Ligand SMILES: Cc1cc(NC(=O)CCCC[C@@H]2SC[C@@H]3NC(=O)N[C@@H]32)cc(C)c1OCC(=O)N[C@@H](Cc1ccccc1)[C@H](O)C(=O)N1CSC(C)(C)[C@H]1C(=O)N[C@H]1c2ccccc2C[C@H]1O
């Protein structure tokens with residue numbers, strides 16, 4: 643698909659058996675989702691941007707479906723204001739910026 | 742161009758006759774640049790990022806080139822960690838997400 647940028651580029655994702663809405667964010671290195679359970683070990687991490695830093699849990703090897711496209715990678719979980727699909731998963735679904 | 746997301750989507754911009762590096766950020770509604778001098782009057786705005794909110798100065802109708810593409814629009818100035826080109830200007834340069 644081709645997604646224009648007149649509006650926020652929100653899509654439906656499936657993660658951990660749950661449907662969520664998430665923002666396709668080329669400015670985010672990583673992927674961060676609001677509080678939810680995920681399988682496996684985790685380690686704490688600080689992520690930063692506008693407004694400063696938040697503490698998240700880093701889970702690895704998390705299978706995800708983004709607008710119908712499956713991708714595996716690290717997913718961060720914590721008090722993000724918005725669910726965010728970052729570059730680590732955008733690459734895997736073949737997403738590019740074009741102009 | 743087609744910009745892949747294996748690396749950060751950094752480009753060169755020109756604003757006030759000066760070249761700067763900036764991030765093409767589909768998660769940003771607006772465009773925010775690190776402290777610099779812009780002409781004219783400004784208006785207040787507060788915007789929220791991953792860590793919380795920052796106060797910025799809003800300048801309108803600013804001439805700005807993004808990866809060689811000419812735009813004229815709103816530029817916000819404040820304590821962002823990265824010069825961010827957001828959707829207000831990504832739309833002016835005809836950028837889309839594609840997969
Ligand atoms: C989000 C935002 C809003 C405004 N304007 C407004 O809010 C004005 C309100 C008007 C509302 C209009 S009107 C009708 C429509 N409907 C609606 O709901 N809105 C519209 C202005 C700016 C500049 C905005 O972006 C701020 C921002 O920081 N956005 C970031 C994403 C985000 C969105 C919302 C909450 C929190 C974060 C950005 O895309 C990013 O990734 N950034 C900006 S700074 C940065 C380049 C470092 C990077 C970053 O944080 N990255 C970090 C990141 C993020 C996630 C996971 C890991 C990490 C590590 C690091 O890479």
Ligand SMILES: [Cl-]
Nearest residue numbers: 745746747748
């Ligand atoms: Cl790349």
